[PDB]
Amino acid sequence: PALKLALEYIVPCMNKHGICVVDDFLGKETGQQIGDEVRALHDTGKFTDGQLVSQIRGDKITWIEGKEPGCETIGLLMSSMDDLIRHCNGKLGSYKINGRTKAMVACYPGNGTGYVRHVDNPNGDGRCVTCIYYLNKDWDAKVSGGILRIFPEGKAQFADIEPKFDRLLFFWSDRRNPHEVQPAYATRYAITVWYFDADERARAKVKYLT
Ligand SMILES: O=C(NCc1ccc(Oc2ccccc2)cc1)c1cnc(-n2cccn2)nc1O
Ligand SMILES: [Mn+2]
C-alpha cells in the first residue's frame, strides 16, 4: 500500500539513487482505462498546446487538470501520485513539497521521434520531483524503442527506463538527472507531473519580482 511503498522504497531509493521505478502501479483495468482516455484525446486532436505561439519539440502535448469530462481516470492517477508524495512528506531529501503542476500528456508519433537530452529544471524554477506514468500496452523496446535514458550525476553508468505499461517513474528534476528519450517506432504515450519545493518556488517568485 501507498504508505509502505513510500517509506520502504520510494524515500530510501530517492535519497540513494535519485531515480525510482514502481511497476504495476495501478493495475491492468485502470491502466487500460487511462490508455483509452489518452487515445481519445489523441483521436480528437487535443494535443494542441503551444500550437498558437511562435518560437522545437517533435512530440505533441496537452495539459490535463484531471477533472475534465473523459479525463477522470487520469485525475485518479494524479490522486494516487499525490498519495505517494504525501506519504513521503518531509523525507524526500531536503524538500518540503507543497504543490504540483497539472498532468502533461505527451504523444510520440513513432516515426523515430524522441526527445533531445535536457534537464527538466536547470535554473531553480521550483520543480523538485519529476513523476512520469507510462501507459503503453505490451511495449517491446527492442522493436519500438522509446527508452528514457537518464545520466545521473555521481554514477558511472546511465539508467535506461523502458516506458512499460503501468510503470511509474520518479526522479529529481534538477541538474542531477539529465535525460533524453530515444527514438520511438510505435506511438508512445507518457504522463508527467512535476512537484514543487516550497522555498525554491518562493525564491523563484522573488527573482521574478526582483
Ligand atoms: O520542462 C519541461 N517543460 C517545460 C515546463 C514543464 C513544467 C512546468 O511547470 C511549471 C509551472 C510553473 C512553474 C514552474 C514549472 C513549466 C515548464 C519538460 C521536461 N521534460 C520533458 N521530457 C520529455 C521527454 C522526457 N522528458 N518535457 C518537457 O516539456
Ligand atoms: Mn524531461
Author numbering: 189 to 243, 251 to 405
What do the authors say?
The PHDs are Fe(II)/2‐oxoglutarate (2OG) oxygenases that catalyse hydroxylation of prolyl‐residues in the oxygen degradation domains (ODDs) of HIFα. The oxygen‐dependent prolyl hydroxylation of HIFα isoforms signals for their degradation via the ubiquitin‐proteasome system. Inhibition of the hypoxia inducible factor (HIF) prolyl hydroxylases (human PHD 1–3), with consequent increases in HIF levels, is being pursued for treatment of anaemia (via increasing erythropoietin) and has potential for treatment of other ischemia‐related diseases. We report structure–activity relationship and crystallographic studies on a promising class of 4‐hydroxypyrimidine‐containing PHD inhibitors.
To explore diversification of binding in the hydrophobic pocket at the PHD active site entrance, we selected the 4‐hydroxy‐2‐(1H‐pyrazol‐1‐yl)pyrimidine scaffold because we predicted its C‐5 amide group would bind to the PHDs analogously to the C‐3 group of the spiro[4.5]decanone series. An X‐ray crystal structure of a truncated domain of PHD2 (tPHD2) with MnII (substituting for FeII) and complexed with 8 was obtained. The overall fold is similar to previously reported PHD‐inhibitor complex structures (backbone root mean square deviation with a structure of tPHD with 18: 0.7564) (S2‐3).7 The structure reveals a binding mode for 8 involving chelation of the active site metal via nitrogen atoms of the pyrazolo and a pyrimidyl rings which adopt a coplanar conformation. The pyrazole ring of 8 occupies the entrance of the active site pocket that is occupied by the CH2CO2H group of 2OG during catalysis. Instead of interacting with an inhibitor carboxylate, the guanidino group of Arg‐383 is positioned to interact with a formate ion, likely derived from the crystallization buffer. The terminal phenyl ring of 8 forms an edge‐face π‐stacking interaction with Phe‐391 and interacts with the Arg‐396 side chain. Recently, we reported SAR studies on spiro[4.5]decanone containing PHD inhibitors, leading to the identification of a hydrophobic pocket close to the Fe(II) binding site of the target enzymes. The side chains of Trp‐258, Trp‐389 and Phe‐391 in PHD2 are positioned to make hydrophobic and π‐stacking interactions with the biphenyl substituent of spiro[4.5]decanone derivatives. Targeting the hydrophobic pocket at the entrance to the active site of the PHDs enabled identification of 4‐hydroxy‐2‐(1H‐pyrazol‐1‐yl) pyrimidines selective for the PHDs over structurally related 2OG oxygenases. Modulation of inhibitors elements binding in this region will likely be useful for further optimizing 4‐hydroxy‐2‐(1H‐pyrazol‐1‐yl)pyrimidines potency, and for improving the cellular activity of the compounds reported here.
